[PDB]
Design an enzyme around this catalytic site. Sequence first.
Site, mmCIF file in Angstrom:
data_model
loop_
_atom_site.group_PDB
_atom_site.id
_atom_site.type_symbol
_atom_site.label_atom_id
_atom_site.label_comp_id
_atom_site.label_asym_id
_atom_site.label_seq_id
_atom_site.Cartn_x
_atom_site.Cartn_y
_atom_site.Cartn_z
ATOM 1 N N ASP A 137 6.299 18.702 8.776
ATOM 2 C CA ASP A 137 6.818 19.410 9.950
ATOM 3 C C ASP A 137 8.065 18.705 10.492
ATOM 4 O O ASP A 137 8.753 18.037 9.717
ATOM 5 C CB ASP A 137 5.666 19.504 11.009
ATOM 6 C CG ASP A 137 5.745 20.741 11.825
ATOM 7 O OD1 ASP A 137 6.754 20.872 12.555
ATOM 8 O OD2 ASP A 137 4.837 21.625 11.868
ATOM 9 N N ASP B 114 -1.700 10.807 23.929
ATOM 10 C CA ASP B 114 -2.816 11.592 23.399
ATOM 11 C C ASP B 114 -2.811 11.772 21.884
ATOM 12 O O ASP B 114 -3.588 12.581 21.365
ATOM 13 C CB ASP B 114 -2.852 12.962 24.072
ATOM 14 C CG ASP B 114 -4.261 13.518 24.197
ATOM 15 O OD1 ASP B 114 -5.254 12.747 24.229
ATOM 16 O OD2 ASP B 114 -4.430 14.763 24.265
ATOM 17 N N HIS C 222 7.954 20.877 17.775
ATOM 18 C CA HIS C 222 6.992 21.714 17.019
ATOM 19 C C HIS C 222 5.950 20.868 16.264
ATOM 20 O O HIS C 222 4.751 21.119 16.434
ATOM 21 C CB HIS C 222 7.783 22.625 16.080
ATOM 22 C CG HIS C 222 6.951 23.525 15.230
ATOM 23 N ND1 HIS C 222 6.462 23.133 14.004
ATOM 24 C CD2 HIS C 222 6.565 24.823 15.398
ATOM 25 C CE1 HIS C 222 5.791 24.148 13.461
ATOM 26 N NE2 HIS C 222 5.898 25.198 14.257
ATOM 27 N N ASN D 45 5.075 34.935 10.797
ATOM 28 C CA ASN D 45 5.079 35.736 12.021
ATOM 29 C C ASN D 45 5.917 37.005 11.854
ATOM 30 O O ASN D 45 6.590 37.478 12.817
ATOM 31 C CB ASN D 45 5.681 34.958 13.199
ATOM 32 C CG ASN D 45 4.949 33.660 13.471
ATOM 33 O OD1 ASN D 45 3.756 33.514 13.144
ATOM 34 N ND2 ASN D 45 5.665 32.716 14.053
HETATM 35 CA CA LIG Z 1 -7.377 13.710 24.863
#
Ligand SMILES: [Ca+2]
Lengths: 63, 275
Positions: free
Chosen positions: B32, B41, B64, B155
């Site tokens: 990516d 996180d 992205h 898409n």
């Molecule tokens: Ca978390």
Amino acid sequence: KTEWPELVGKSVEEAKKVILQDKPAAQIIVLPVGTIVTRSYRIDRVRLFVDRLDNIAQVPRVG
Amino acid sequence: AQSVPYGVSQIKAPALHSQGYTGSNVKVAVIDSGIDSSHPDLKVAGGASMVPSETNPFQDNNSHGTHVAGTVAALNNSIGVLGVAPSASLYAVKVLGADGSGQYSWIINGIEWAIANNMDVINMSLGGPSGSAALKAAVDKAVASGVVVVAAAGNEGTSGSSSTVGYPGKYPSVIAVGAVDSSNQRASFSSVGPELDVMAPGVSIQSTLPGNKYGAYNGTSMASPHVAGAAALILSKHPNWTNTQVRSSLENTTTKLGDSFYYGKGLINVQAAAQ
Ligand SMILES: [Ca+2]
Ligand code: NA
């Protein structure tokens, strides 16, 4: 509204004229036909994929 | 405070977590735009950049790759979101630049790096409308080597009776993933065709963004990592299963949704797939 079949074979400025009339907030991105792109769907974005002559090669659509 | 995005629940990942299976030691390559490894996180295990002028895969100049990565493996903690496979070993394989596009040769290089580095799962939330023999060779090589290879279907919506599934999703070796919303309805943009394999949540998917941020985006790009994460959950429970077995298991235990042209086999259920 989401796609422009009538723009296939048109120039970039031609394509942008029709898109910006139908969709004045469009964020238009021009790329060569043989490019890999992300598969996010972004409601304001219109990717323009162009052939060797700089003409629209694929039906432009929103996303 | 941590929130569980609906998509994570919808595929029944928390059933796996509650059994003690969270993707530990499964290597997932997110091929990516990079991954922001500084996001609190996310934990990035490793990676490499194939983009000539953007050589740090641990920086994501687009956003992205970071969002896709958070769907796979956002950490289980007291902040942000929870990923499908929160203990998975996440690899940033940068093949797209800041503008969200890449050359076929960069993608192929990323796929070859994932094979050489023994990744268990590849996620490609990317594609184009035409393939190439070299791209096909690379994904076929990965699968033959044992890698579960997952990709966004595209898409491109509908086009009469024609397939609109793009490459590399359209290749048989690759699991092509379409997008549904929280009611299991097909997103209007989701590509269609007989190459559609399974669906996953791909509308208003909350995930990580660079700059210690979170936001919700739409796309088969968001659908694909639910399936790559599910593959990792399955392999954490069944480390001896082959990529063939993980794939059939996902395809065979879906919640059927409708016409295979529009929905493939239906919605993955990782709880059922992992037994
Ligand atoms: Ca978390
Ligand atoms: Na038809």
